[PDB]
């Protein structure tokens, strides 16, 4: 079934401003400080061009250049409410997007003459950084998540379509990060910020928020957002990146997020006041649920960042956030969803995704054919660039298959590259590696094909092979510490698999296939079609395995290994009562 298709670049960072006008027209508004404009599609999301908004559509009095205001349709009136990411006013439409707009006053009236700066002084100003207005309780209430970076998320609530407002009694919070190993310092503290909210079929609200932890945190409301439960970790991995929840016409829930694990903090990292560097925003993922979140499927990469391997990744526009974080979605038909995602004009995209692809149970790859589109292989030059970035290099390269043919295969080794080391930071990204996504499974079978490079190897040369539940950097040697299953291929004294205690030898100068068949807390490992050993689960997962990760283990420059094919098949383990 159709792979994700890039169709355009939105005129603002993703997360706000994407709105369906009618069955064929979809718009994405902008944060422009000049005359308002939007990107528009008149063929239900296929093709796009820029267009000026009419003079009755208000300028961005608040907000910022890189982000659109949020624009949300009131399901009862079919008019719209607009709020900014930060600052500005509350506008309500009369006659749709190209109709008359009115601004909400502090006393709960409507101002037609909002172009008058004096009259703008008695307009309602909702505080905090805001995300997306959401209509709940059969359209009778609208709530807007807002946060303070240190204080957490609460909700602006209106029961009269946006004329008058109050604040929730509480909201969502999440704990500070602790600099335990392998961290050498503290992650930027964000207290459950940038929430997305979904109304469940029974009326409960689910809030999912960005944190300093390894995963998003969540809380629930039984009173349409007045009060919220004690916050807890969610199942959606990711740190200092953003979540979006939505619902399709048939009731299926969609979760969009950046399913990554950042590199551990380095010795230069602070105490939570400010971040160091982002090493975790070069992907976006999708999962779906047909049973109000009791079970999930997919956890598929929508896209990898095209610039991820580039030594000039941050070189231009140093202060501006970039990558594939943030998203907003609009259903296009029964099977297809339009997603705006990412940050920075060179990185943000509009992508169409098919739910039947989300529900697929197999995937296969060959490094030489598929590196650019499907493989994460970047390492970082650990020298801070711009506000919070690192420039990159590919950590592995393609070489000729020594067997002959046209096949190109990926050489994964310990690099000799001083640019990948920072002694003061106390980090060393010279171990090359590679990681690849597949549909999530609590049970499955993954096979890969590898060969020892005919060259000098160090005493600890080899490959650590891990099944994981999010995308770990190619150069992250700590992946094995978070892995669901992990084991080393060791090259010295002679080549062998270490499967706990058991050494399983294999020949140099030849291709070998390894299989990993996992189910529950065990994986059976096979070598060239013969059972070789068993691995105990190293870490539990709320979801299952959706990545395989391969990283070199050598501590001195070496020749390493070659990686050819990978394939995966996972199974549905259906709900039943025999437990
Ligand atoms: Cl303002
Ligand atoms: Cl505004
Ligand atoms: Cl409020
Ligand atoms: Cl302790
Ligand atoms: Cl849930
Ligand atoms: Cl590339
Ligand atoms: Cl550079
Ligand atoms: Cl910034
Ligand atoms: Ni910053």
Coordinates of C-alpha atoms and ligand atoms in Angstrom, one line a residue:
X1 CA 0.0 0.0 0.0
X2 CA 1.1 3.6 -0.6
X3 CA 4.2 4.9 1.2
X4 CA 4.1 8.4 2.7
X5 CA 4.2 11.1 0.0
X6 CA 5.6 14.5 0.5
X7 CA 3.2 17.0 -1.3
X8 CA 4.4 20.5 -0.2
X9 CA 6.3 22.7 2.3
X10 CA 4.0 24.6 4.7
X11 CA 4.5 28.4 5.1
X12 CA 5.0 28.1 8.8
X13 CA 6.3 25.5 11.2
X14 CA 3.9 22.7 11.7
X15 CA 1.5 22.5 14.7
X16 CA -1.0 25.3 14.0
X17 CA -2.9 26.8 11.1
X18 CA -3.8 23.7 9.0
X19 CA -7.6 23.8 8.4
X20 CA -10.2 22.2 6.2
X21 CA -12.4 24.8 4.5
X22 CA -14.7 22.4 2.6
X23 CA -14.6 18.9 1.0
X24 CA -11.9 20.0 -1.5
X25 CA -10.3 23.1 -0.1
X26 CA -7.6 22.9 2.7
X27 CA -5.5 25.8 3.9
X28 CA -2.3 26.3 6.0
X29 CA -2.0 29.8 7.4
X30 CA 1.2 31.5 8.3
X31 CA 2.9 33.6 11.0
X32 CA 3.7 36.4 8.5
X33 CA 4.0 39.9 10.1
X34 CA 3.0 41.4 6.7
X35 CA -0.4 41.0 5.0
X36 CA -1.8 37.6 6.0
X37 CA -1.5 34.7 3.5
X38 CA -2.0 31.0 3.4
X39 CA -1.0 27.9 1.4
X40 CA -4.1 26.4 -0.3
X41 CA -5.0 23.1 -1.9
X42 CA -8.2 23.0 -4.0
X43 CA -7.8 19.2 -4.8
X44 CA -8.2 17.8 -1.3
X45 CA -4.5 18.1 -0.4
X46 CA -2.6 17.0 -3.6
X47 CA -1.3 20.3 -4.9
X48 CA -0.7 23.7 -3.3
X49 CA 0.0 27.4 -3.9
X50 CA 0.2 30.6 -1.8
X51 CA -2.6 33.1 -1.7
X52 CA -3.2 36.4 0.0
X53 CA -6.0 36.4 2.7
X54 CA -8.7 39.0 2.2
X55 CA -8.5 42.3 4.1
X56 CA -11.2 41.2 6.6
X57 CA -9.0 38.4 7.9
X58 CA -7.0 39.9 10.8
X59 CA -3.2 40.3 10.8
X60 CA -1.1 38.4 13.2
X61 CA -1.1 41.0 16.1
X62 CA 0.4 38.3 18.4
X63 CA 2.3 35.2 17.5
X64 CA 5.7 35.0 15.9
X65 CA 7.0 34.9 12.3
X66 CA 7.6 31.1 12.2
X67 CA 4.3 29.9 13.6
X68 CA 0.7 30.3 12.4
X69 CA -2.2 31.0 14.8
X70 CA -4.3 28.0 15.6
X71 CA -7.7 27.9 13.7
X72 CA -10.4 25.6 14.8
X73 CA -14.0 25.1 13.6
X74 CA -16.8 25.3 16.2
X75 CA -18.9 22.2 15.4
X76 CA -22.2 23.8 16.4
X77 CA -21.9 27.2 14.7
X78 CA -19.5 26.1 12.0
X79 CA -17.6 29.4 12.6
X80 CA -14.0 29.5 13.6
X81 CA -11.9 30.5 16.6
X82 CA -8.3 31.8 16.2
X83 CA -5.6 32.1 18.9
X84 CA -1.9 32.6 18.5
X85 CA 1.0 30.5 19.9
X86 CA 1.7 33.3 22.3
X87 CA 0.2 36.8 22.7
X88 CA -2.5 38.5 20.6
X89 CA -6.2 38.1 20.8
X90 CA -9.2 35.8 20.4
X91 CA -10.9 36.1 17.1
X92 CA -14.3 34.6 16.1
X93 CA -15.5 34.4 12.5
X94 CA -19.0 35.4 11.2
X95 CA -19.4 33.9 7.7
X96 CA -16.3 31.7 7.7
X97 CA -12.6 32.3 7.2
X98 CA -13.2 34.9 4.5
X99 CA -16.1 36.5 6.4
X100 CA -16.2 39.1 9.1
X101 CA -13.9 38.6 12.1
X102 CA -14.6 39.9 15.6
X103 CA -12.3 40.2 18.5
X104 CA -13.4 39.1 22.1
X105 CA -13.3 42.0 24.6
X106 CA -12.3 41.7 28.3
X107 CA -16.0 42.1 29.2
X108 CA -17.2 39.3 26.9
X109 CA -18.4 41.4 24.0
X110 CA -17.4 41.4 20.3
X111 CA -15.2 44.2 18.7
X112 CA -15.7 44.6 15.0
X113 CA -13.2 47.5 14.7
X114 CA -10.1 45.6 15.9
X115 CA -7.9 47.4 13.4
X116 CA -8.1 50.4 15.8
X117 CA -5.1 50.0 18.2
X118 CA -6.8 52.0 21.0
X119 CA -9.8 49.6 20.9
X120 CA -7.4 46.6 20.9
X121 CA -6.4 47.7 24.4
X122 CA -9.6 46.2 25.9
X123 CA -9.4 42.9 24.1
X124 CA -9.1 39.6 25.9
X125 CA -5.5 38.4 26.0
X126 CA -5.1 34.7 26.9
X127 CA -1.8 34.1 28.7
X128 CA 0.9 31.6 28.3
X129 CA 2.1 29.6 25.3
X130 CA -1.0 28.1 23.8
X131 CA -1.7 25.1 21.6
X132 CA -4.9 24.0 19.9
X133 CA -8.4 25.0 20.9
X134 CA -10.5 21.8 21.2
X135 CA -14.3 21.7 21.3
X136 CA -15.5 19.1 23.8
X137 CA -18.8 17.9 25.4
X138 CA -20.7 17.8 22.1
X139 CA -19.3 21.1 21.1
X140 CA -20.6 23.0 24.1
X141 CA -17.2 23.9 25.6
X142 CA -13.9 25.0 24.1
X143 CA -10.6 24.5 25.9
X144 CA -7.1 25.8 25.0
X145 CA -4.0 24.2 26.5
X146 CA -1.5 26.8 27.8
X147 CA 1.8 26.5 29.7
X148 CA 4.5 28.2 31.6
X149 CA 7.8 26.3 31.1
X150 CA 8.5 25.8 34.8
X151 CA 4.8 25.8 36.2
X152 CA 3.1 23.3 33.8
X153 CA 0.0 23.2 31.6
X154 CA -3.4 24.4 32.4
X155 CA -6.5 25.2 30.3
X156 CA -8.3 28.3 29.2
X157 CA -12.0 27.3 29.2
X158 CA -15.0 28.9 27.6
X159 CA -18.6 27.6 27.8
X160 CA -20.0 30.3 25.4
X161 CA -18.0 29.7 22.1
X162 CA -15.0 31.9 23.2
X163 CA -16.8 35.1 24.6
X164 CA -15.9 34.5 28.2
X165 CA -13.1 32.5 29.8
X166 CA -11.8 30.9 33.0
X167 CA -8.8 28.8 33.9
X168 CA -8.8 25.1 34.9
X169 CA -8.2 24.4 38.6
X170 CA -5.1 22.4 37.7
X171 CA -3.5 20.7 34.6
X172 CA -0.5 18.6 33.8
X173 CA 2.9 18.5 35.4
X174 CA 6.0 16.3 35.0
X175 CA 9.2 15.9 37.0
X176 CA 12.6 17.4 36.5
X177 CA 15.3 15.3 34.8
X178 CA 18.1 13.8 36.9
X179 CA 21.7 13.6 35.7
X180 CA 22.1 9.9 36.4
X181 CA 24.4 7.9 34.2
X182 CA 24.8 7.9 31.3
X183 CA 23.9 11.6 31.5
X184 CA 26.7 14.0 32.6
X185 CA 24.3 16.9 33.2
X186 CA 20.6 17.9 33.3
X187 CA 18.1 18.1 30.4
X188 CA 16.3 21.4 29.9
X189 CA 13.4 21.4 32.4
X190 CA 10.0 21.5 30.8
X191 CA 7.0 21.0 33.1
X192 CA 4.5 19.0 31.0
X193 CA 4.3 21.7 28.2
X194 CA 2.8 21.8 24.7
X195 CA -0.2 19.5 25.5
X196 CA -2.4 17.9 23.0
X197 CA -5.9 16.9 24.2
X198 CA -8.3 14.3 22.9
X199 CA -11.9 13.6 24.0
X200 CA -12.4 9.9 24.5
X201 CA -15.6 8.3 23.4
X202 CA -16.8 8.2 27.1
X203 CA -16.2 11.9 27.6
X204 CA -12.9 11.6 29.4
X205 CA -10.2 14.1 28.2
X206 CA -6.7 12.8 27.7
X207 CA -3.9 15.3 27.8
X208 CA -0.5 14.3 26.5
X209 CA 2.4 16.6 27.1
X210 CA 6.1 17.2 26.3
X211 CA 8.6 16.6 29.2
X212 CA 12.2 16.3 30.2
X213 CA 11.7 12.6 30.8
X214 CA 12.2 9.7 28.3
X215 CA 8.5 9.9 27.4
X216 CA 5.6 12.3 27.2
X217 CA 3.5 12.4 30.3
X218 CA -0.3 12.4 30.5
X219 CA -3.3 13.2 32.7
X220 CA -7.1 12.8 32.4
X221 CA -10.2 14.9 33.1
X222 CA -13.7 13.6 34.0
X223 CA -15.1 17.1 34.0
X224 CA -14.2 18.4 30.5
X225 CA -11.0 20.0 31.7
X226 CA -11.8 21.7 34.9
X227 CA -9.8 19.3 37.0
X228 CA -7.2 16.6 36.1
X229 CA -5.8 13.5 37.6
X230 CA -2.3 12.9 39.0
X231 CA 0.1 12.9 36.0
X232 CA 1.9 9.7 34.8
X233 CA 4.3 8.6 32.1
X234 CA 2.7 7.9 28.7
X235 CA 3.5 5.1 26.3
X236 CA 4.8 7.6 23.8
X237 CA 8.6 7.9 24.0
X238 CA 10.3 11.2 23.3
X239 CA 11.9 14.1 25.1
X240 CA 11.4 17.9 24.6
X241 CA 9.4 17.1 21.4
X242 CA 5.7 17.5 20.7
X243 CA 2.7 15.2 20.6
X244 CA -0.5 15.5 18.5
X245 CA -3.7 13.4 19.0
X246 CA -6.6 13.2 16.6
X247 CA -9.5 11.1 15.6
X248 CA -10.7 9.8 12.2
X249 CA -14.3 9.8 11.0
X250 CA -14.7 6.1 11.9
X251 CA -13.5 6.7 15.5
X252 CA -9.9 5.5 15.2
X253 CA -7.4 7.5 17.2
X254 CA -4.2 8.8 15.7
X255 CA -1.0 9.6 17.7
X256 CA 1.7 11.7 16.0
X257 CA 5.0 12.3 17.7
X258 CA 8.8 12.2 17.4
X259 CA 9.6 8.6 18.7
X260 CA 13.3 9.2 19.5
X261 CA 15.8 8.9 22.3
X262 CA 18.2 11.8 22.5
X263 CA 21.9 11.3 23.2
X264 CA 22.8 11.5 26.9
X265 CA 23.6 15.0 28.2
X266 CA 27.3 15.9 28.1
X267 CA 29.5 17.5 30.8
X268 CA 28.6 21.1 29.5
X269 CA 24.8 20.6 30.3
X270 CA 23.3 22.8 33.0
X271 CA 20.8 22.3 35.7
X272 CA 17.5 22.5 33.8
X273 CA 17.5 26.3 33.0
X274 CA 18.4 26.0 29.3
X275 CA 19.1 23.2 26.8
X276 CA 22.5 22.3 25.4
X277 CA 21.8 20.6 22.0
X278 CA 19.0 18.7 20.3
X279 CA 19.9 15.3 19.1
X280 CA 16.4 13.8 18.6
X281 CA 14.3 15.8 16.1
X282 CA 15.1 14.1 12.7
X283 CA 11.9 11.9 12.5
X284 CA 8.2 11.8 13.0
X285 CA 6.0 8.8 13.7
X286 CA 2.4 7.6 13.7
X287 CA 0.4 5.1 15.7
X288 CA -3.3 4.3 15.6
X289 CA -5.8 2.7 17.9
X290 CA -9.3 1.4 17.2
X291 CA -10.3 0.7 20.8
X292 CA -9.9 4.0 22.7
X293 CA -6.2 3.4 23.3
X294 CA -6.2 -0.1 24.9
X295 CA -4.1 -1.3 21.9
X296 CA -1.9 0.5 19.4
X297 CA -0.4 -0.4 16.1
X298 CA 2.1 1.2 13.7
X299 CA 4.8 3.2 15.4
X300 CA 6.0 3.8 11.9
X301 CA 8.3 6.6 10.7
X302 CA 6.4 9.0 8.5
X303 CA 9.7 10.5 7.3
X304 CA 13.3 11.0 8.2
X305 CA 14.9 14.4 8.0
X306 CA 16.6 14.9 4.6
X307 CA 19.4 17.0 6.0
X308 CA 20.1 14.6 8.9
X309 CA 23.6 13.6 7.7
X310 CA 24.7 17.1 6.6
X311 CA 27.9 18.9 8.0
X312 CA 26.0 22.2 7.3
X313 CA 22.8 21.1 9.1
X314 CA 22.7 24.1 11.4
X315 CA 25.1 26.4 9.5
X316 CA 22.4 28.7 8.1
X317 CA 19.8 30.4 10.3
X318 CA 21.7 29.3 13.5
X319 CA 19.0 30.5 16.0
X320 CA 16.0 28.8 14.3
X321 CA 14.7 25.3 15.4
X322 CA 14.8 22.7 12.6
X323 CA 13.9 19.1 11.9
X324 CA 10.7 17.0 11.9
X325 CA 9.2 17.8 15.3
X326 CA 5.6 19.2 15.7
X327 CA 2.6 18.1 13.6
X328 CA -1.0 18.8 12.8
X329 CA -3.4 16.5 10.8
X330 CA -6.4 16.5 8.6
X331 CA -8.2 13.4 7.3
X332 CA -8.5 13.4 3.5
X333 CA -10.7 10.3 2.9
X334 CA -11.3 6.9 4.4
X335 CA -7.6 5.8 4.1
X336 CA -5.5 9.0 3.8
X337 CA -4.4 11.6 6.3
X338 CA -2.6 14.9 5.5
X339 CA 0.0 15.8 8.1
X340 CA 1.9 19.0 8.4
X341 CA 5.1 18.4 10.3
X342 CA 8.5 19.8 11.1
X343 CA 10.2 23.1 11.8
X344 CA 12.3 25.6 9.6
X345 CA 11.5 26.3 5.9
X346 CA 14.1 23.8 4.7
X347 CA 12.7 20.9 6.8
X348 CA 8.9 21.3 7.4
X349 CA 6.7 19.3 5.1
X350 CA 3.1 18.4 4.2
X351 CA 2.9 14.6 3.8
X352 CA 0.0 12.2 3.0
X353 CA -0.1 8.9 4.9
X354 CA -2.3 5.9 4.3
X355 CA -3.7 4.0 7.3
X356 CA -3.3 0.7 5.6
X357 CA 0.4 1.4 5.5
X358 CA 0.2 2.1 9.3
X359 CA -1.4 -1.3 9.8
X360 CA 1.2 -3.3 7.7
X361 CA 2.9 -6.1 9.5
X362 CA 6.1 -6.5 7.4
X363 CA 8.9 -4.4 6.0
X364 CA 12.2 -5.1 4.3
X365 CA 15.3 -3.2 3.3
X366 CA 18.7 -3.4 1.7
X367 CA 21.2 -0.8 2.8
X368 CA 22.7 0.0 -0.6
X369 CA 19.2 0.7 -2.2
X370 CA 17.5 2.2 0.8
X371 CA 20.0 4.2 2.8
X372 CA 18.8 7.6 1.9
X373 CA 15.1 7.0 2.6
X374 CA 15.1 4.5 5.4
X375 CA 18.3 4.5 7.4
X376 CA 19.5 6.6 10.3
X377 CA 23.3 6.6 10.3
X378 CA 24.3 10.1 11.4
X379 CA 27.0 10.9 13.9
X380 CA 27.6 14.5 15.3
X381 CA 30.5 16.8 15.3
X382 CA 30.2 17.7 19.0
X383 CA 30.7 21.5 18.6
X384 CA 27.7 23.6 19.4
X385 CA 26.2 25.4 16.4
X386 CA 23.7 28.2 16.4
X387 CA 21.3 28.2 19.3
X388 CA 21.2 24.5 20.1
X389 CA 22.4 22.3 17.1
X390 CA 25.2 20.0 16.1
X391 CA 26.4 19.6 12.5
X392 CA 26.6 16.0 11.3
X393 CA 28.4 13.4 9.2
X394 CA 27.3 10.0 8.0
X395 CA 28.8 7.5 10.5
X396 CA 28.9 4.7 7.9
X397 CA 29.3 4.4 4.1
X398 CA 28.4 2.0 1.4
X399 CA 31.0 -0.2 -0.2
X400 CA 31.0 -2.9 -2.8
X401 CA 29.7 -6.4 -1.7
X402 CA 33.0 -8.4 -1.7
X403 CA 31.0 -11.4 -3.1
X404 CA 30.6 -9.4 -6.4
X405 CA 27.4 -8.3 -8.1
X406 CA 26.2 -4.7 -8.0
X407 CA 25.0 -4.8 -4.3
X408 CA 26.4 -2.1 -2.1
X409 CA 26.5 -2.8 1.6
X410 CA 27.0 -0.6 4.7
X411 CA 30.4 -0.7 6.5
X412 CA 29.9 -0.1 10.2
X413 CA 33.1 0.5 12.2
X414 CA 35.0 2.6 14.7
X415 CA 36.0 5.7 12.8
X416 CA 39.3 7.6 12.9
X417 CA 37.9 11.1 13.0
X418 CA 39.0 13.6 15.7
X419 CA 36.2 16.0 14.7
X420 CA 33.7 13.5 16.3
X421 CA 35.3 13.9 19.8
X422 CA 35.0 16.7 22.4
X423 CA 37.3 16.1 25.4
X424 CA 35.8 19.0 27.4
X425 CA 32.2 17.9 26.7
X426 CA 33.5 14.4 27.4
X427 CA 31.8 12.7 24.5
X428 CA 33.1 10.6 21.6
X429 CA 30.9 9.8 18.7
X430 CA 33.4 7.8 16.6
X431 CA 31.5 4.5 16.8
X432 CA 29.6 4.2 13.5
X433 CA 26.2 2.6 13.5
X434 CA 22.8 2.3 11.8
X435 CA 19.1 2.0 12.8
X436 CA 16.0 1.0 10.9
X437 CA 12.3 1.1 11.7
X438 CA 9.6 -1.6 11.3
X439 CA 5.9 -1.9 12.4
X440 CA 5.7 -2.4 16.1
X441 CA 5.2 -6.0 17.5
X442 CA 5.2 -7.6 20.9
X443 CA 6.1 -10.7 19.0
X444 CA 8.0 -10.8 15.7
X445 CA 10.8 -12.1 13.6
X446 CA 13.7 -9.9 12.3
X447 CA 16.5 -11.2 10.0
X448 CA 19.6 -9.4 8.9
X449 CA 22.7 -10.3 6.8
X450 CA 26.2 -9.4 7.8
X451 CA 29.8 -10.1 7.0
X452 CA 33.2 -9.4 8.7
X453 CA 35.3 -6.9 6.8
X454 CA 38.6 -8.4 5.7
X455 CA 40.8 -5.9 7.5
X456 CA 42.6 -5.2 10.8
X457 CA 40.3 -5.3 13.9
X458 CA 40.7 -4.1 17.5
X459 CA 40.3 -6.4 20.5
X460 CA 36.8 -5.1 21.2
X461 CA 35.7 -4.7 17.5
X462 CA 32.2 -6.0 16.7
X463 CA 28.6 -5.0 16.5
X464 CA 26.1 -4.5 19.3
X465 CA 22.7 -5.5 18.0
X466 CA 19.6 -4.2 19.8
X467 CA 15.8 -4.3 19.4
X468 CA 14.3 -1.0 20.7
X469 CA 11.0 0.8 21.1
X470 CA 12.2 4.2 19.7
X471 CA 14.9 5.6 17.4
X472 CA 18.3 5.7 19.1
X473 CA 21.1 7.6 17.4
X474 CA 23.4 5.6 15.2
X475 CA 26.3 6.7 17.3
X476 CA 24.7 6.0 20.7
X477 CA 26.7 3.3 22.5
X478 CA 24.2 3.3 25.5
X479 CA 21.4 1.9 23.3
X480 CA 22.0 -1.6 24.7
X481 CA 21.2 -0.3 28.2
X482 CA 17.6 0.7 27.1
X483 CA 17.1 -2.1 24.6
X484 CA 14.3 -4.7 24.8
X485 CA 16.8 -7.3 23.5
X486 CA 20.5 -6.8 22.9
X487 CA 23.7 -8.9 22.2
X488 CA 27.2 -8.4 20.8
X489 CA 28.8 -9.8 17.7
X490 CA 32.4 -10.0 18.7
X491 CA 35.3 -10.3 16.2
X492 CA 38.2 -11.2 18.5
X493 CA 39.8 -13.5 19.5
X494 CA 37.8 -15.1 16.7
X495 CA 34.3 -14.1 15.4
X496 CA 31.4 -15.2 17.6
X497 CA 28.0 -14.3 18.9
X498 CA 27.8 -13.9 22.7
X499 CA 24.3 -15.0 23.8
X500 CA 24.5 -14.4 27.5
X501 CA 27.1 -17.0 28.5
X502 CA 27.3 -19.0 25.2
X503 CA 29.8 -18.1 22.5
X504 CA 28.5 -19.1 19.0
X505 CA 31.4 -19.1 16.5
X506 CA 31.0 -18.2 12.8
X507 CA 33.3 -17.9 9.8
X508 CA 35.0 -14.7 8.6
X509 CA 35.0 -14.0 4.9
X510 CA 31.4 -15.0 4.4
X511 CA 27.9 -13.6 4.7
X512 CA 25.8 -14.8 7.6
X513 CA 22.1 -14.4 8.4
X514 CA 20.9 -13.9 12.0
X515 CA 17.2 -14.2 13.0
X516 CA 15.7 -12.8 16.2
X517 CA 12.3 -14.3 17.1
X518 CA 10.9 -12.4 20.1
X519 CA 7.8 -13.2 22.2
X520 CA 7.2 -11.8 25.7
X521 CA 10.4 -11.7 27.7
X522 CA 12.5 -14.0 25.5
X523 CA 14.1 -13.9 22.0
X524 CA 15.4 -17.0 20.1
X525 CA 18.5 -16.2 18.1
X526 CA 19.3 -18.3 15.0
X527 CA 22.5 -18.2 12.9
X528 CA 22.2 -19.4 9.3
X529 CA 19.0 -21.2 9.8
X530 CA 20.0 -23.0 13.1
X531 CA 18.9 -22.1 16.6
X532 CA 22.0 -20.6 18.3
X533 CA 20.7 -19.4 21.7
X534 CA 18.2 -17.4 23.7
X535 CA 18.2 -13.8 25.1
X536 CA 16.3 -12.7 28.2
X537 CA 14.5 -9.4 27.8
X538 CA 16.8 -6.6 29.1
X539 CA 14.1 -4.0 29.4
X540 CA 10.3 -4.1 29.4
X541 CA 8.4 -1.9 26.8
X542 CA 4.8 -0.6 27.0
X543 CA 4.6 -1.2 23.2
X544 CA 7.0 -3.7 21.7
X545 CA 9.9 -3.5 19.3
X546 CA 9.8 -1.2 16.3
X547 CA 13.6 -0.6 15.7
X548 CA 16.7 -2.6 15.1
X549 CA 19.9 -0.8 16.0
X550 CA 23.4 -1.8 15.1
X551 CA 26.5 -0.1 16.5
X552 CA 30.2 -0.7 16.2
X553 CA 32.0 -1.7 19.5
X554 CA 35.6 -1.1 18.6
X555 CA 37.6 1.4 20.8
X556 CA 40.3 1.9 18.2
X557 CA 39.9 2.5 14.4
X558 CA 39.0 -0.9 12.8
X559 CA 37.5 -2.5 9.7
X560 CA 34.2 -3.5 11.2
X561 CA 31.4 -5.3 9.6
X562 CA 29.2 -5.1 6.5
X563 CA 25.4 -5.0 6.7
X564 CA 23.2 -6.0 3.7
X565 CA 19.5 -6.8 4.2
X566 CA 17.1 -6.5 7.1
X567 CA 13.6 -7.8 7.2
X568 CA 10.8 -7.9 9.7
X569 CA 7.5 -9.5 10.3
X570 CA 5.3 -8.9 13.4
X571 CA 2.0 -10.5 14.5
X572 CA -1.2 -9.2 16.1
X573 CA -1.6 -10.7 19.6
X574 CA -5.4 -10.3 19.7
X575 CA -7.4 -9.4 22.9
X576 CA -8.8 -12.5 24.7
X577 CA -9.9 -13.5 28.2
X578 CA -7.8 -16.7 28.8
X579 CA -5.3 -15.1 31.2
Ligands
LIG1 CL1 0.4 40.6 22.2
LIG2 CL1 -3.8 38.0 17.1
LIG3 CL1 -8.7 31.8 30.5
LIG4 CL1 19.6 7.2 44.2
LIG5 CL1 -4.7 6.1 26.6
LIG6 CL1 21.9 11.7 3.4
LIG7 CL1 30.3 21.7 10.7
LIG8 CL1 14.7 29.3 18.8
LIG9 NI1 16.8 27.4 23.6

